[PDB]
């Protein structure tokens, strides 16, 4: 089998991108943000508390003939950004793009964070990091994917994000005609749940290209590019009038500036980020102080290759016996 849905962005700085998901019997569609940087499956739903949901569309259990209360099962969750939600669980057929799992654990959520109650076009969150990292209580569940694999014609995953503009996520097969040149795998690590992998440098706009390792994840549900200070610092150095602000909480710059390129390595070939898919506006409504896309992972504990840097390609996530990722220019 295969599946295939497009994916979209929130807003007009490509915050998030949010993808259908058919929930139960009959189906129920929500619009859920893809991470691969997580492994829970959760949604607002009827039980979610009231005064927590403001204009997002919920999941009713109670409305599904397929869905099947997971006797004594609980979670709950915390995220990089702070925000956090927990809840009870559900299991329900769910089907991506035309991909259909029967069986799959749907969280249900009782208690969600402001940040989740305040976007309103986020439904909830579908995770596609490893299954080791779901938090689901005192039996841990499989993701989607996981789910999904044995079926898949290939078991593996890609992500096709678009700048200011749609995407695509496949399942089970490779769109030879979504990139260009050929796709380059590198190894992961699975020890810490995540799609970890190690970039071989960076150069910044025009400039000489650095050989140096850069382990991190490659991470759809966060949005900017965090890396080493001393990477972060190299290439904002490049924008006249850019600086760190501890008050913003990162780099900002001139929303006058021209922002350079930045260059990632995967093995010998080399992804291209082009400089405004770096930009992220004003930091208020009215600001010449535009916010940074690249941004220092110091105090994260982990470097990530966000949707700044993933949108710059194609990127196959390959969840063979032994994993990899790959990446190709589009």
Do not use: M
């Amino acid at each position: 089998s295969t599946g295939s849905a497009t994916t979209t962005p929130i807003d007009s700085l490509d915050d998030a991108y949010i993808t259908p998901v058919q929930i139960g019997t009959p189906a129920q569609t929500l619009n859920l943000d893809f991470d691969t940087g997580s492994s829970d499956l959760w949604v607002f739903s009827s039980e979610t508390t009231a005064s927590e949901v403001d204009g997002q569309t919920i999941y009713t259990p109670s409305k599904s003939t397929t869905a099947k209360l997971l006797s004594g099962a609980t979670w709950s969750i915390s995220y990089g950004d702070g925000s956090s939600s927990s809840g009870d669980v559900y299991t329900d057929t769910v089907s991506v793009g035309g991909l259909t799992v029967t069986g799959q654990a749907v969280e249900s959520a009782k208690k969600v964070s402001s940040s989740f109650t305040e976007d309103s076009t986020i439904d909830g969150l579908l995770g596609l990091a490893f299954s080791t990292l779901n938090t689901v209580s005192p039996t841990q569940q499989k993701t989607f994917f996981d789910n999904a694999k044995a079926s898949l014609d290939s078991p593996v995953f890609t992500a096709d994000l678009g700048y200011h503009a749609p995407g695509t996520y496949n399942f089970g097969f490779i769109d030879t005609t979504a990139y260009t040149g050929s796709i380059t795998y590198t190894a992961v690590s699975t020890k810490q749940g995540f799609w970890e992998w190690t970039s071989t440098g960076y150069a910044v706009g025009s400039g000489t290209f650095k050989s140096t390792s850069i382990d991190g994840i490659a991470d759809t549900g966060t949005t900017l590019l965090y890396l080493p200070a001393t990477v972060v610092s190299a290439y904002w150095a490049q924008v006249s009038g850019a600086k760190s602000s501890s008050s913003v909480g990162g780099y900002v710059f001139p929303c006058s500036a021209t922002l350079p390129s930045f260059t990632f390595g995967v093995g010998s070939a080399r992804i291209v980020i082009p400089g405004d898919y770096i930009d992220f506006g004003p930091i208020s409504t009215g600001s010449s102080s535009c916010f940074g896309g690249i941004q220092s992972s110091a105090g994260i504990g982990i470097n990530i290759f966000g949707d700044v840097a993933l949108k710059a390609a194609f990127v196959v996530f390959n969840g063979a016996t032994t994993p990899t990722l790959g990446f190709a220019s589009k």
